[PDB]
Every structure is written in C-alpha cells, then in structure tokens.
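Design review, sub-item: ligand-bound model
Attendees: FS, YL, KQ
YL presented the inputs for the 2-acetamido-2-deoxy-beta-D-glucopyranose complex:
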Amino acid sequence: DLRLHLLLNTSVTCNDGSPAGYYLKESRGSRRWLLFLEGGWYCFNRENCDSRYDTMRRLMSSRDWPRTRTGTGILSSQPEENPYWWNANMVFIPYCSSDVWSGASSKSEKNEYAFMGALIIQEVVRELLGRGLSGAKVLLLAGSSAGGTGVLLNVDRVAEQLEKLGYPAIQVRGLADSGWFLDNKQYRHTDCVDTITCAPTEAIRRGIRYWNGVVPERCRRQFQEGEEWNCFFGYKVYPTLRSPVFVVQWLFDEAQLTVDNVHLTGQPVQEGLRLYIQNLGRELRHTLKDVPASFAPACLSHEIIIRSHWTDVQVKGTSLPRALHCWDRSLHDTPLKGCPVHLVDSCPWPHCNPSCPTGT
Ligand SMILES: CC(=O)N1CC2(CCC2)c2c(F)cccc21
Ligand SMILES: *[C@@H]1O[C@H](CO)[C@@H](O)[C@H](O)[C@H]1NC(C)=O
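KQ shared the predicted structure:
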C-alpha cells in the first residue's frame, strides 16, 4: 500500500480548495523514484466543472480520499507484477485539478475553482526532497491519459526545478502513457457549441484560459501567445523537450476515437469508417517514427502502465516492462542486442496484434 500525505503547503489545492497530496511507499536503499500522474479527462468552464464536481468529485477534491491506495502495474512492489521497477520508491499523485496538469490558478473571488496541476507536481517534488528524494539518482515522472499528457507538459519543469534547487545529479525522465493525441479530422464533425460537441483543440484552447494553463517554455516560444494549445499535442511538444521521454500509446486509443466521434458497436464497419480507422493508426505510427523510446501496440484500448496485467502485451515479442528495462540500459553512462526500445506495431487494424488486451 501507498500512504496518503496531504501537501504541507495548503495553498496548493485541488479544484475546490481542499489540499492536494500524494500517496507514497518508500523503498529504503533504492535511489529510483517513480512519480505517477493520474488521469481522468478535464473540465473547461463553470458548467462542465460543476457537473464534474457532482459525479466525479474525487477528481476535484481530496475531502473523500482514502488514507491508502494499492500500487498496481508499474506502481506494484511485487516483481511478479512489476518486472521493471518493483523496488523503486513509489508515488501516486491523484489528479484533482481537472486541467491536464497544466494549471497555475488559485480559487479566489474571481475563480470558483483552483486549477493548480502544474503547481501540485512542483510542490510534491519539493516536499519529497525532505523524504528521501534528495538522494535519488533517477526520477521517472510517469502518467496515464491526462496524466500522460501531464508528463509531456511537466517533465522539463521538474528537471529545471531540481537543477535550481541544487540537485543536478538527479536524472529526470518521462513516461507518457496514453497521452499522445492527434488534432486530426473527426469522423463526424460537430461545431463547438457545448461540452460534448467541442473538439479537443477548442476545448483545450478554452481550458488554458480558464485554468491559466502553462506549457513548456520552448514549445511556448515556438507557438506563442494564443497558440499554446498546440503544446498539449504530443507530436508537437515532444521535439521541444530535453528530458528523455518514453512514449506508450495504443495506435487505436479509445479516448482518441471518442474525441473523433467514432463509436464501435457490433455491426460491420463500412468502407468510410474502415479507412478512417486505418488512417488513424497510420498517422499515429507516423508521429512515432522519430521517437526512439516508444511502445505502440495495434490495439483498441486505453491506458497500460498501472493495470495489473500490463506485462501481457508485446510488440514484436517484447513486453513493455522489458522495453522500459532496455530504455534504462540505453541511458547508462548504440542499440542493444535483443533489448529494443522502439516498438511500434505496423499492422493496420485493432487486435491484429494477438497480445492486445481482451477487454474481459
Ligand atoms: C482524447 C484527446 O484528444 N485529449 C486531448 C488532450 C489535450 C491534449 C491531450 C486530452 C487530455 F489532456 C486528457 C484526456 C483526453 C485528451
Ligand atoms: C506554497 O505554494 C505557493 C504556490 O506554488 C508558493 O508561492 C509558496 O511560496 C509556497 N509556500 C511555501 C511556504 O513554500
């Protein structure tokens, strides 16, 4: 189990002003630290945030958080479940800011909600330094879904923070799971008039203003004022990043398909939708061509790294825990024989890879 710690700096809050926090399981004698960012969509205006507060309140408030959580997948401490980093110091950072981990805005007379995702990460790192993180050799900032995009938005800021605090020896790396989205054409198009019809580009554009969202500096300088939404799209922000980032992305991610207005039921897929889906997988594969550390199976699914059976999926015969281990070796101070780090499926239809999650 990982034990809850509410932030000692109570100015760093979840959406409703309750303190943010983190769950921690220490591993004495390990200098590896895994900080995992939870996902869970986002909200971008008063109405849709109010709705989220009614029925997804744990994503907006710490008032009902349990005092412990069980580490699963890459957060498991059992080598049977986590071949990669079972002995690491484990941190699970709950997502309670609804801002894709980008916000830097407090609740105030002008703001019904606080959007502090970027500051929560910084404050967790700061408070962990006194709990052993000061001795770390590697800090892996990982995350799934909105948390995976949060890795892309925050990994270099964590690196800068540690450098400015006087810890230049801690190697900061990112692991972005299911947070690599395409600003592609939707299969069916709706004008952004409400929440359900608003495409991610426009919803993120509105969110950034509502959250006071922040993006990595080099990406911000490329796209400039009013265009920072571009930095929420992995293929655009990734080339601007300096920290090593391993990208995990299903080629047919269910959240990507949802925002594309694709809803697979059971009837035969006809030609237009068949071509749409195949083109989506091809475009995703294309965006990963120059990403040297990546794991992209041809499956219709969503998230991987904290699932208990995350070890099952393989690309070209290599599992994700193995690929991550090979990534670790590649970052020791030329490719490795039989230890690949770039694993992208080439087959063109969901479940053409036999190791895809069953959905059972
Ligand atoms: C499914 C999808 O296109 N997006 C867009 C975005 C903004 C760039 C990543 C996102 C999140 F930040 C969290 C959940 C879904 C999504
Ligand atoms: C608490 O966090 C805020 C926001 O990041 C920061 O401005 C402030 O200095 C912090 N307070 C302390 C005592 O560290």
